């Protein structure tokens, strides 16, 4: 729970997990960066946003990356013209509109 | 023995010390093993 982590101020557990690459789900109302870039997806740019937590002992600057790859993406030819399965380590916990 | 294992009342102890038949028979009927054993000892010692 990001709220409890921030309130308690002890980042030992999250720091250990982020250092040792242990799967975890950070729960809390977060703002995300919408990225429609297939090359940004390939660059694994969504996994480079958590180090600031360890560096600063704060979680109010955490801003996950939500990939949005469509036909109106400027790089969708990479998805269309090659035999690969787009993949990202991170996922954003969000609900589709009603 | 009776006081240790049964904690008799003050009145009962008074009557037993005075050798009151009422308290003696009350204990006998109540089936106190200690009193019954003492009385049986007396009856058996009444050999002849």
């Amino acid at each position: 729970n990001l709220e409890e982590l921030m309130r308690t101020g002890s980042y030992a557990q999250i720091t250990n997990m982020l250092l040792n690459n242990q799967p975890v789900a950070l729960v809390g109302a977060l703002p995300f960066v919408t990225d429609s870039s297939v090359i940004s997806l390939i660059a694994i740019l969504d996994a480079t946003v958590f180090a600031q937590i360890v560096k600063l002992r704060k979680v109010d600057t955490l801003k996950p990356i939500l990939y949005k790859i469509n036909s109106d993406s400027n790089d969708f030819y990479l998805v269309a013209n090659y035999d690969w399965v787009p993949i990202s380590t991170t996922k954003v916990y969000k609900q589709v509109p009603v | 023995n009776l006081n240790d294992n049964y904690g008799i009342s003050r009145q009962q102890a008074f009557n037993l010390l005075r050798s009151d038949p009422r308290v003696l028979r009350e204990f006998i009927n109540q089936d106190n093993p200690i009193i019954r054993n003492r009385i049986e000892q007396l009856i058996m010692q009444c050999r002849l």
């Binding site: - | 049964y6 904690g7 008799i8 009342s9």
Partner: protein, 397 residues
């Protein structure tokens, strides 16, 4: 109960840790616990006793906190601490005795003394400390309805019973077959005797059985099983079953063959040992079944043929025995055993203060009667009083 244990534990840790010259870093946490105990107990009045010859005593707490500005304890610090600890220990002793001398058919585990009822309030939960001892640990476990376990050395699980059962007899008691046994504490000695030495028995083998049901389920018990009952191997004169007359027993011991010891739980054979002696293990059982046979020796030297005739006059009576001792065991309920003094302490307090016989326990805390009728109410009351006795023993030497 937990608060009483915590008081006792704090006082014991104070009497042992707070010693002149010791670093304050060795006793900082203990002194914090002690100060919180004093703060919580201050301004409360308690009354103990009033039952039997136990005197009515009143307790008032207005104490100052132990200091915390010293890097090492000196004589004065220990002196003041001891002055406070003596009064607290006296209060704990009287609370424990007042609780031990009381019973209740309903809610046996609930506090019975006024002092313990008052301590059960929520303001006193602030002083709880650590519940490390075996009895308080099991108290908390049974309070949460977990699996408790007490480890006993020679558990006192069998009520005293010395008796005999005859399967063949006559008015003259000159040709008898049957069994004799003593069950006592943790030891069963059983001897089957046959006067005819199975001369007319089918296959010259006489079967004997002995069933000892335990009042509680023992677990992981180490048991010593030896092939002879030394208690029934000498001449005896024994009252007849009705008591009218007496009969003569003149044993001569043979080895028991086809020894089968079966430990059963709810009628299901959990462990079974055949012709096995020494240390055996019974993991979980509530009944013991000993089967053993007297077999007439197929070949006899003259001195044995003289012993065992085929005519009626049977001067020497064949006997085969077994001894079975429970060296150690584990029980979910509480029992008196050879290594613990809890039953002795409870009985001593009751006898010393002439506590009137109550509605739950038998007179004088007679263990034979307790175990013979170990009802759930008796178990609850006994566990409460044993826990209080252990708490008291923490402090009173």
């Amino acid at each position: 109960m937990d608060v009483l244990y915590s008081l006792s534990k704090t006082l014991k840790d104070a009497r042992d840790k707070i010693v002149e010259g010791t670093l304050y870093s060795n006793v900082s946490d203990l002194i914090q616990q002690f100060n919180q105990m004093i703060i919580t107990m201050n301004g409360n009045e308690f009354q103990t006793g009033g039952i039997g010859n136990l005197p009515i005593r009143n307790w008032n707490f207005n104490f100052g906190l132990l200091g915390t500005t010293l890097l090492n304890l000196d004589a004065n610090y220990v002196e003041t601490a001891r002055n406070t600890i003596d009064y607290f220990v006296d209060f704990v002793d009287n609370v424990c005795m007042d609780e031990m001398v009381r019973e209740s058919q309903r809610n046996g585990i609930a506090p019975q003394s006024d002092s313990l009822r008052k301590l059960s309030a929520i303001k006193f939960k602030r002083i709880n400390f650590d519940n490390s001892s075996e009895y308080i640990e099991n108290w908390n476990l049974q309070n949460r309805r977990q699996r408790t376990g007490f480890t006993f050395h020679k558990p006192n699980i069998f009520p005293y019973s010395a008796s005999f059962t005859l399967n063949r007899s006559q008015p003259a008691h000159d040709n008898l077959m049957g069994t004799m046994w003593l069950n006592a504490g943790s030891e069963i000695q059983v001897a089957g005797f046959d006067y005819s030495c199975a001369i007319n028995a089918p296959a010259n083998i006489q079967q004997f059985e002995h069933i000892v049901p335990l009042r509680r389920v023992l677990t992981t018990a180490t048991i010593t099983l030896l092939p002879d009952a030394e208690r029934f191997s000498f001449p005896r004169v024994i009252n007849s079953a009705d008591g009218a007359t007496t009969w003569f027993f003149n044993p001569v011991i043979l080895r028991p063959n086809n020894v089968e010891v079966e430990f059963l739980l709810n009628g299901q054979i959990i462990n079974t040992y055949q012709a096995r002696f020494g240390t055996i293990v019974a993991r979980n059982f509530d009944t013991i079944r000993l089967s053993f046979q007297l077999m007439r020796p197929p070949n006899m030297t003259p001195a044995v043929a003289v012993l065992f005739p085929n005519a009626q006059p049977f001067e020497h009576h064949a006997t085969v025995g077994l001894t079975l001792r429970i060296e150690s065991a584990v029980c979910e309920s509480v029992l008196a055993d050879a290594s613990e003094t809890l039953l002795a302490n409870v009985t001593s307090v009751r006898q010393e203060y002439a506590i009137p016989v109550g509605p739950v326990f038998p007179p004088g805390m007679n263990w034979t009667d307790l175990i013979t009728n170990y009802s759930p109410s008796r178990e609850d009351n006994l566990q409460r009083v044993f826990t209080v006795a252990s708490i008291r023993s923490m402090l009173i030497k």
